[PDB]
Amino acid sequence: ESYNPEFFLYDIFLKFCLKYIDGEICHDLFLLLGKYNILPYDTSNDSIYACTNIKHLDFINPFGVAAGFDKNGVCIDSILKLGFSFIEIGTITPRGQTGNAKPRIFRDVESRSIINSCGFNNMGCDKVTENLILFRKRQEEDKLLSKHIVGVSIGKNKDTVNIVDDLKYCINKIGRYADYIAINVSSPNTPGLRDNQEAGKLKNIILSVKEEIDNLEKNNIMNDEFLWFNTTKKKPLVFVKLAPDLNQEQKKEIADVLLETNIDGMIISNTTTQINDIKSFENKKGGVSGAKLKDISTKFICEMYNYTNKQIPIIASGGIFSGLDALEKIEAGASVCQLYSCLVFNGMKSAVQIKRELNHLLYQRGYYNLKEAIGRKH
Ligand SMILES: Cc1cc2nc3c(=O)[nH]c(=O)nc-3n(C[C@H](O)[C@H](O)[C@H](O)COP(=O)(O)O)c2cc1C
Ligand SMILES: Cc1c(C2(c3ccc(C(F)(F)F)nc3)CC2)c[nH]c1C(=O)N[C@H](C)c1nc[nH]n1
Ligand SMILES: O=C(O)c1cc(=O)[nH]c(=O)[nH]1
Ligand SMILES: [Mg+2]
C-alpha cells in the first residue's frame, strides 16, 4: 500500500502542501524523502510499444524529469523509481551558487502554473559530479536501474565572461558519467545567458562542447578504467535547450546552425517571460512553467521540426500533464517528453498516471507503437 505512488494519502498531503506550504519547502521535503529512500515507487514493467530512442539512447518509456528538479543529483534513484525513464540533473555551473534571493518560486494551482527566479542554485560541478558518481556505482550493482538514463544540464556561473570556459570545465569533470549533455543557453534568470542563442555564438558553443567531448575520448581511450561510466557506455550526446521567447528569424537561424553542427537533439523548451495573465504572478519576476506554456511550446516544436527538416530529434518540455498532452507533443515532432510542473501538481502518481493515459491513447488512435506517432501531425 504505502509503496504505491497512487496510495490515497499522497493526494491528500499534496493538496494541503499546495495550499498552505511554501513551494521551496515542499521541494526540500520531497528531496529529503528521496534522500532517505522513502518515496513510493512504481512496480510496473513498461510497455514495449511506448519505448523510444534518440540516436543510441534507448528510453524504456517516454517520460523523464526536466532539468532543475534535482539540481544537485541527490535524488536520482528515487525520482527514477517513481516510473520515469530518465532525468536531467542540473543545471550545474563550475562553482556553486546559492542563487537569487528568496522567495523566488511561486505556484498558481488554479492555472497549474509556476514562476521562478532561482538563478542556477547548485552545489557546483565538482560536488554534483561526486553525487552522480555515487549513483553510477549503485546503478552498476542494481539491475533495476541499468537501463535508466541520466543527462546533465550545464551552464555558466553568473559572473563568468566567456560561457565556453564554464561549459568545457563541466565537460572535463562530469562528462564521462553523463549519457547526454544539455547546453543551457535559455534560462531567463542569468543576465545575458539567452544572448548565446544568436547563431554565431551558438555555433561556436556547440562546436566547442563537441570538441571537448571528443578530446575527452581521445586522451583516455587506452586507460585501464573504461572512460564512459554511464548507461550507454558511449560518449554523451549533445543537446541544446532553447527558450520559447525568440522571433521567427532567430528560430530559423538557430535551426540552420543545428543542422550544420550536427547537434544530437533539441530540448523545446525552457520557461517563458511572455505570460502575464496570471493575476497572482503580477509583479513577480522569472520564467513561467506549466499549463500556460503548453501551447507556446507545442507550436515551437512544430516550427523547429520543420525548420530543421525533421533531421534533429526533439525532447519536449512545457505544460505536459496528461497522455493527450504527451501525444500532442509527439505528433508535433517530439521523440520523448520531460515533466516538471506535472510532478509539482500531480505528485507521486505523475509517471504511473501519464504512462497509463498515453498507452490507452495509443490503443484508441490505432498506432502500433509510439515511434509511429512521432511527427504525424505533419
Ligand atoms: C523551479 C524551476 C527550476 C528550473 N530550473 C531549470 C534548470 O536549472 N535548468 C533548465 O534547463 N530548466 C530549468 N527549469 C525549467 C524546466 O526544466 C522546464 O523546462 C519548464 O519548467 C517547463 O516544463 P513544465 O511546463 O513541465 O514545468 C526549471 C523550472 C522550474 C519551475
Ligand atoms: C509540490 C511539490 C512536490 C511534490 C510533494 C512535496 C511534498 C510532499 C509531502 F510529502 F510533503 F506531502 N508531497 C509531494 C508533488 C511531489 C515536489 N516539489 C514541489 C514544489 O512545489 N516545487 C517547487 C515548484 C520548487 N521549489 C524548488 N524547486 N521547485
Ligand atoms: O535556475 C533557474 O532560475 C532556471 C534555469 C532555467 O533554465 N530555467 C528556469 O526557468 N529557471
Ligand atoms: Mg565545483
Give the CA dihedral 249, 251, 255, 258, nearest 10 degrees: 120
SS3 state of residue 115: strand
Q: Which of 92, 90, 88, 79 is nearest to 145 (CA)?
A: 79
What does DSSP assign to residue 29?
H
172 is known to lie in a ligand binding site = no
Element (H, E) at 43: none
Quote the cell numbers at residue 255. 535551426
Residue 19 CA to ligand 4 centre (angstroms): 36
Residue-range domains of the chain with CATH: 8-373 (3.20.20.70)
d(CA 230, CA 151): 10
CA 291 vs CA 19, 23, 115, 271, 298: distances in Å: 18, 17, 12, 11, 11
H runs (alpha helix) in the chain: 8-20, 23-35, 76-80, 125-141, 163-174, 199-219, 248-261, 294-307, 323-332, 341-346, 350-365
User: Phi, psi at residue 34, to the nearest 5°?
Assistant: -70, -40
* AA identity, residue 364: Q
Question: Is 319:290 a contact under the CB 8 Å cutoff?
Answer: yes
Report the side by side order of strands in the sheet with 105-108: 105-108, 113-116, 287-290
**Catalytic pick from 78, 85, 113, 187?**
187
Q: Is 187 a catalytic residue?
A: yes
Element (H, E) at 111: none
State the closest ligand 1 atom to the C-alpha of 105, by its place in the atom list counted from 1. 1
Quote the cell numbers at residue 164. 565556453
Query: Using a 6 Å cutoff on CB, does residue 118 contact ligand 3?
Result: yes
Quote the cell numbers at residue 253. 537561424
Residue 220 CA to ligand 3 centre (angstroms): 33
Give the CA dihedral 202, 207, 213, 215, nearest 10 degrees: -150
Query: Using a 6 Å cutoff on CB, does residue 116 contact ligand 3?
Result: yes
> According to the entry, how was the structure determined?
X-ray
d(CA 339, CA 356): 15
Ligand nearest to the CA of residue 129, numbered in listed order: 4
**Which of 156, 185, 271 to probe ligand 1 with, by most ligand atoms within 8 A of CB?**
271
Whether the bond into 5 is cis, omega within 30 of 0: no
Q: Can you tell me which residue has the cell 525532447? A: 315
Question: Is 90:241 a contact under the CB 8 Å cutoff?
Answer: no
- DSSP secondary structure, 160-226, as one string: -S-HHHHHHHHHHHHGGG-SEEEEE---SSSTTGGGGGSHHHHHHHHHHHHHHHHHHHHHTTT-SS-
Q: Which of 72, 70, 71 is nearest to 80 (CA)?
A: 70
Quote the cell numbers at residue 346. 500531480
CB under 8 Å to 177, separation ≥6 — which residues?
A: 129, 132, 133, 136, 150, 152, 229, 230
Resolution of this entry, Å:
1.8
Residue 221 CA to ligand 1 centre (angstroms): 35
* Nearest protein Cα to ligand 3, atom 7: 187
